[PDB]
Symmetry: D2
Subunit: 424 residues, 4 copies
């Protein structure tokens, strides 16, 4: 069900050496910087970006960097990444890319300054891929009357690794496909397993190669040493991104980084604390059942201890939302190994159902365990709408329903400023 190469969605912008595959993300810790990235195929081109705010129409120029990579018998085009910094909060900016030959213009809006009661609405997309189903989820998102403002992406971007020799073209088409959204609003990236791409057979053994060339993140903003785990703050939220497929043993860089990072969250500043990861810690579908155990045994207590609000994951191609549950009492022989309701624990949601290559995970653990509050095997996307320092409303819209039909919906009460039972 992968959309064919000629699909209107994969068409290449016309013009000589016209910037294609345009995409953006936050470029700093707090909201006033963006990383613009794109690809030119005819020749190298300029890595300069021109931008100006709607109000103070003064045109400034940011100069970035260019790179390329070869995968097997494949060779990328010219990848560019430029970071515009020191933007003003809450203002619309226009940016142009492809200055030398054919220029293209886009716009984005900086978020509001970080604050306790600042509202903001995030979209949740996981496991997109490029099937027709993928196309549908993306439009439904684009049409959600509750306008999404940033997409928190949970992993498995294009599934190009399913093609022979991981046909990296499929990375190009995906990038062209999603530009309609990412050229305009940032998508926060998380690495999934389809991004690992360990292919000894074709002599490609550096994990995450294509993904890392194409998608950049402000990892040094948090003091991370790798782009696979980082953190950013935006509006009233503090987002922490983790890498299920990187290492988390005690003492490793990721473990060490997260320990420090959790100590840096200030709920008086960013009330909402969200964590993103690919492989779900709590999952009742048969597929990938219990894979999240190892990371679970390692970070769960931290999450309960710092009161994280939600934990979004993907990987299982279906939907599921749990109860605030914890299972942090086991000591091997004491037999205390059963998830228990805990109002300090975060809610674990899994939205890996945006489409992939058109396949859904339907078999599930029967009967629905206690920790599971709702599960459904349908394609869709989610929206996490922050309202106050106390309220945030989550929704799940199915691809079968109309754009405005929330097939599941829930209010979240801030584990810090209003820890009442939302566990309903």
């Amino acid at each position: 069900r992968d959309m064919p190469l000629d699909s209107d969605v994969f068409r290449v912008p016309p013009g000589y050496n016209a910037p294609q595959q345009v995409h953006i993300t936050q470029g700093d810790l707090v909201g006033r910087a963006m990383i613009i990235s794109w690809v030119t195929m005819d020749e190298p081109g300029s890595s300069a970006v021109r931008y100006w705010s709607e109000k103070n129409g003064r045109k400034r120029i940011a100069k970035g960097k260019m790179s390329t990579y070869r995968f097997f018998n494949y060779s990328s085009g010219f990848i560019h990444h430029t970071t515009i910094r020191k933007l003003k909060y809450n203002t619309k900016y226009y940016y142009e890319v492809g200055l030398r030959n054919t220029t293209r213009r886009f716009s984005f809006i900086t978020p509001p300054q970080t604050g306790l009661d600042v509202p903001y609405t995030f979209g949740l997309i996981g496991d997109l891929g490029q099937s027709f189903d993928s196309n549908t989820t993306l439009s439904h998102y684009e049409l959600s009357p509750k306008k999404g403002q940033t997409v928190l992406f949970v992993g498995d971007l294009s599934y190009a690794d399913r093609y022979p020799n991981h046909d990296n073209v499929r990375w190009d088409t995906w990038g062209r496909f999603t530009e309609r959204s990412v050229a305009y609003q940032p998508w926060i990236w998380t690495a999934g397993n389809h991004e690992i791409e360990f292919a000894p057979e074709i002599n490609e053994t550096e994990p995450f190669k294509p993904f890392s060339y194409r998608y950049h993140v402000p990892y040094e903003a948090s003091q991370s040493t790798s782009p696979f785990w980082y953190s950013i703050k935006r509006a009233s939220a503090h987002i922490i991104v983790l890498s299920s497929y990187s290492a988390y043993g005690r003492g490793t860089p990721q473990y060490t980084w997260l320990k420090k990072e959790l100590r840096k969250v200030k709920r008086s500043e960013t009330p909402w604390l969200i964590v993103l990861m690919h492989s779900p810690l709590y999952n009742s579908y048969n597929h990938h059942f219990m894979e999240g155990e190892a990371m679970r045994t390692k970070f769960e207590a931290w999450f309960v201890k710092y009161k994280v609000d939600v934990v979004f994951a993907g990987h299982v191609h279906a939907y599921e939302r749990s109860e605030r549950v914890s299972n942090i009492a086991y000591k091997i022989t004491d037999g205390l190994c059963t998830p228990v309701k805990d109002q300090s624990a975060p809610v674990y949601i899994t939205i890996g159902d945006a489409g992939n290559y058109g396949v859904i995970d339907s078999n599930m653990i029967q009967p629905q365990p206690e920790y599971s509050a709702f599960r459904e095997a349908s394609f869709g996307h989610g929206m996490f709408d922050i309202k106050n320092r106390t309220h945030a409303h989550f929704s799940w819209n199915r691809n079968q329903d109309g754009v405005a039909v929330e097939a599941d919906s829930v209010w979240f009460f801030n584990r810090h400023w209003y820890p009442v039972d939302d566990s309903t």
Copy 2:
């Protein structure tokens, strides 16, 4: 408690640019190759090694490679690594190193061809370090009347990272200290946490740097893509080394590698299957209690499924030997989370008590759980003596006892050729 820099044990071989810190390991999959490694400090020197068998006294020459590294305000000398290959099994070889200026001679004996009933005796050392205690354990090993023939090293080599800026000299002194043994019999390396050395503060953020420059392993012999997990066969054993501090998520290179590797073990060929790792899966001391959970949740079933015989670990600075136990029935809600006796399960032994910087882990879990067969907080080393395809005898000698006093002893019955009850 660490031995002082002037300790006789740290003395530098005399002569201009005299080879120091000499050491060896198996260099191929089956036994007929060695990797000789050493360091010269005055100037680069030759990386050629001259060797000849006692019988056919014809002198041949192997040419290797030289490298250097800088840690913080530290600079290595000239590290050399040369692989002699195509040796004859079961023969004494003499090798000379430092051909240009001051030459030094050593010898080693290739192991017997791999076989079903070929006996061999391994020493077990873990968490050595360089305290006086360390010195002791090493001598006790050197004196075991049951002559050890290869040391399986379980991790934490020198604790140089405990010194300011990880004073890499402590790596040099450790290398000079242990030469008395390693220059003559191979030691199989395993990476522990003291080897990670992630020091962002001094701008050292590439894990395992010093360890990796200094200690090489034949990882491509198994088709591993990293030197932190590999496998070798020697005599009647098939040894598999893993990395607690590397990644093992589903799909990762280490996970992928182990799955394939277990499929390649042939018990009709190497009856004994041993696994090495630093952080113990089963451990009842308070210190580092339950750190091995994550990896446990990922590899335990495979170990039971392939009937691995023993699993040596270190990290807890003390001794402990368990019962053949398994705990692979948990499914979150079914409450089946208690280690059970399983005769397909391997025996988990932890020997991280060779000395470190002179400190013992004594606080235990009271009371001694069922899975724990014997535990003692004493410094010491172990020996695993293979006898037939069915028998192998393990011993633990305390540093307080005399060289020949086995403070713990047990016979192992091959999980494949003689599955009768050991566990006692």
Copy 3:
């Protein structure tokens, strides 16, 4: 007059990932090693070469290396270079390349052991390019009844740098064009100015990049530190190759290397001493008149001192052969600045007329100076046929004449074993 891309001469060998652009050169100092190089375009492929002698039909395998490069908006295919060594002198060998997918077979004949009276016939080609004229010179060579056995190539290989952005395809077509000769007999390479390719404008500023990726030479055989100046011995000749466009100041690597090298020539072993370079030291055409002055002032005396026999050059697109002349008496104010006949001096010949992009240099210094013995502005190639330690016969065949019509011809008397006046 550049042959069009569809020219039958540029056709690509059929088959999946079929080795194309096959080419060879001597791979050691004395004749018993070859460097096989080729290109595969579909995918990487194997860098193994299979070969066996006609006599002892035992098939052996040599394993080489693979590399790639990008020039501007260009990306090479997979370049391979493999060195077969330890060949037997004077024997025919078959070699196959493209082992994995589509295999191609060729053959070559090792030269005879170096000796005083060993005959051998070299072809002289300079400034080839890929015009139709180039095609003609190459056939005339292929048809010279005096069968050439090795081509000494004087520089300016393909003129791809004349195309926009140095369209490196033109490097591919040239390589395909000349395979008919180079896959079978070695061509010794010399770097000319069309190989420098310094293009700051397109950000290509490393001189000799494409040339160096594609054409390899045994420069370490002589103890050279760069592939732009080296030396080889073959049959009764000792060939020295220099780089007009590299540096030759006093103290530089090239200067230093040549000084030592000249001291290593043994005329009792290789009677004939030949030097190759691109820019001619003695030239009477108007084009490039006096460019060879700087190198001249630096090496001429050495040449006269060691009695080099001939000095072949190219660059001027025409033919010219001089008298044994020297001009090494100048001391600024003494006015002794006029070429004089000297029987210790080498004969300077220029054959840069094989074709280029179809243009000839016709204007010449009028009147023909004394040092010039013969000059003609015609396209052609040359043959230097060694006979004894005393005799060697040089010929120049014009493209207008028939294959067997020597338009100029001369006997050379060895400056060492028979320094009589051949200056006729």
Copy 4:
């Protein structure tokens, strides 16, 4: 004769990780930027530089870069290079270096904006080295009542290459020795042969390695692609630095660069045109007689054509000043090979007599040829004092004379604004 290691001049600034070997140069094309460089030996340290003008005492900070290198059995400390830019012309600046641990303060004065009649006084030092003689020349310079404001350095900095394995310490001592001057006024660098350091024997074969790590120049300011030839404008002068030991063949990068650069000189803007190079084009001493021939044959005409005023060189350890001479009429056979007076030709001066390792080149060519205006084998330094767009006064002070005794003196009349006869 070289000063001993304990010489007071080689003492190391006290303090932990105290900045040593401090030095500066122009950092842009026109005068408003500086490159501060230094070395810290205890540990890496900060590469930030703090500076503020005397007037507007606002302290700003520039952040630079750190690097290290290894020569043979030698290892550099931590070399730092930071470029302060956008300075105001003609103002005193103070700069501090070593911000983390022990800070040191220095000052410099930006030159006046480029102009037709802007005076400036340059010092001329060549072949300094570190003998006692060297110490002397440096003091004499420091004391010239005609205060020098920038040193144009002609090559051969330290002669470290004379020590075994080119004992790079001699590079450190030289850097500490000269700090007294260079930390305060820029010295413009030129590469000489003692900087090449091609030492195959110890496996060092990349020319100019130590020199290049330690001494940086603003070569991209002119659009040069290498740091061995560049150009800067300062006050009323346009200085062009060349590399005798780099390549200058037709087509090479240096040749190509100079041709374009000469076209960019505007005498209406910087009336005085100076060229620096190591090996002198015109020299009548026996030592190194005629080494400058090759480059001469390549660039002389261009110098006459663009009317360069002076050409300073070193290499011959003595002094010599010529007449405005040219010798650009030779055409091989026309016998016109004798230097002739030419008033468009520059004056060739050689000041390689600052000291070296205490040795003078005294053997001259007898008799003093016509082109030579004055020559003397004494240690000394020079000063080139620009006065107007028409006048500039050059002086040569011997080490034997007193600080104010000009042992040779001459007025230069601008070849462009006042071409009357100087040559006397």
